[PDB]
Amino acid sequence: TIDQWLLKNAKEDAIAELKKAGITSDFYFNAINKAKTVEEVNALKNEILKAHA
Known part of the structure; x- marks a missing residue:
């Protein structure tokens, strides 16, 4: 039971x-x-800090 996967919330x-x-x-x-x-x-957002800029 891992429907939460889809995400689409944060x-x-x-x-x-x-x-x-x-x-x-x-x-x-x-x-x-x-x-x-x-x-x-939120983790991917912390990546823009470095991956981008």
Whole structure:
């Protein structure tokens, strides 16, 4: 039982506060859904800190 996988939950609760940080790229926001859990969504955001910029 791992339907939680699909995710699609932290991508909006996180994008709603990251779009203000300035990062407006779509390569990170779109990949925010591929995340597995909330730790994977917020985790990808921490990657833009280095992977990007």
